[PDB]
């Protein structure tokens, strides 16, 4: 009866009147655990439905003329775009914050920091800072391998020198993910087959600094795999991070499953991985050991975020459940002693975290 995680259903979005046809990747955004925005169509003009996660029973509904809407991860500040026209608004103060019109249409965007929305067009990736120039700086041009792909994620490392775009497409009756990992310092990309990814900061024992880790999961033709590779130059005085590559388990009845989401808990150094069919996986960031697996959802959890109050992962499925999984802070070392029988990992979990 001892579980190394803890489960929570925060809210059901059908309780707030959200029709499930607009509960999808194209219409629902969740850039952090504080807000959910949904674009709807009541009448023939559009609406946006903003849900405060600290007051979930009082949503607000404003009319819009935008094709996407993303709330800032920390304030009630909304970014809206209509093709090439981009705008950022303060909701409560009713104040326009900035605006820019592009030359190519922005097909995908996402806040990567408190100040920066990353913009993706059909051939390039831009960073649009709030406190900066008001023109978006071009970061890199998009590789040929990501052409004709549905762009699903963009993530950066903490100091924004390692950038990663992710798209998926259907090749040979399979959802093949194509990633472009870009280094700002050397100005070179690498086309990578991957499905879900995140960067992380990990301090090794015997190290004065942190190492910048790149973590990605993939289901290719050789099965499911999770890689934990250090990117960037290691500082002298620090040992290099030893490269990990472990298997990602899929059951025999789920050969049409693949990873769709990854968040990393920086407090506990734990990789959370969600698959398309609803399975959550927990890996240790240092060794890659699969701690725990369970199917937590019946529908596809299509957008995730960090859940900072519990240092976990929070997500929305297509039914409209807002679900969260985090490490149970009392139970995860009494799970690895008895149920997992890994005593060398369980007390090396204790020094750096507990």
């Amino acid at each position: 009866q001892i579980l190394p995680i803890r489960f929570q259903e925060h809210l059901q979005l059908q309780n707030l009147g959200i029709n499930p046809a607009n509960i999808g990747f194209s219409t629902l955004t969740m850039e952090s655990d504080k807000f959910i925005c949904i674009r709807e169509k009541v009448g023939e003009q559009a609406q946006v439905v903003i849900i405060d996660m600290n007051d979930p029973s009082n949503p607000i509904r404003r009319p819009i003329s935008a094709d996407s809407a993303i709330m800032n991860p920390a304030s009630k500040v909304i970014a809206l775009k209509a093709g090439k026209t981009l705008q950022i608004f303060n909701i409560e103060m009713k104040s326009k914050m900035k605006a820019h019109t592009m030359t190519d249409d922005v097909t995908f965007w996402k806040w990567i920091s408190l100040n920066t929305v990353a913009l993706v067009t059909d051939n390039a990736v831009y960073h649009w800072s709030m406190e900066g120039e008001s023109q978006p700086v071009k970061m890199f041009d998009r590789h040929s391998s990501l052409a004709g792909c549905q762009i699903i994620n963009y993530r950066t490392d903490a100091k924004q020198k390692w950038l990663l775009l992710t798209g998926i497409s259907a090749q040979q009756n399979r959802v093949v993910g194509a990633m472009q990992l870009y280094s700002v310092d050397r100005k070179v990309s690498q086309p990578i087959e991957g499905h879900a990814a995140s960067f992380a900061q990990f301090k090794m024992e015997g190290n004065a600094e942190e190492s910048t880790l790149f973590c990605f999961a993939v289901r290719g033709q050789a099965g499911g795999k999770l890689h934990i590779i250090e990117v960037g130059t290691p500082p002298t005085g620090n040992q290099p991070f030893p490269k990990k590559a472990v298997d990602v388990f899929f059951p025999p009845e789920a050969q049409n499953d693949f990873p769709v989401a990854m968040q990393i808990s920086e407090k506990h150094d734990v990789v959370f991985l969600i698959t398309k069919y609803g399975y959550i996986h927990l890996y240790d960031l240092e060794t890659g050991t699969c701690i725990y697996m369970n199917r937590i959802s019946g529908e596809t959890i299509f957008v995730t975020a960090p859940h900072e109050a519990t240092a976990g992962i929070i997500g929305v499925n297509r039914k409209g459940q807002v679900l969260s999984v985090c490490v149970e802070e009392e139970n995860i070392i009494p799970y690895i002693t008895n149920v997992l029988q890994n005593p060398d990992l369980a007390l090396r979990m204790a020094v750096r975290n507990n």
């Binding site: 041009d141 990992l181 050397r186 070179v188 990309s189 690498q190 086309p191 990578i192």
Partner: peptide, 19 residues
């Protein structure tokens, strides 16, 4: 404009432990 591509990370795990 083409992107310049190369080998940033090694995805291969070695088949021999040379210590």
């Amino acid at each position: 404009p083409s992107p310049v591509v190369g080998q940033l990370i090694d995805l291969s795990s070695p088949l021999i432990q040379l210590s």
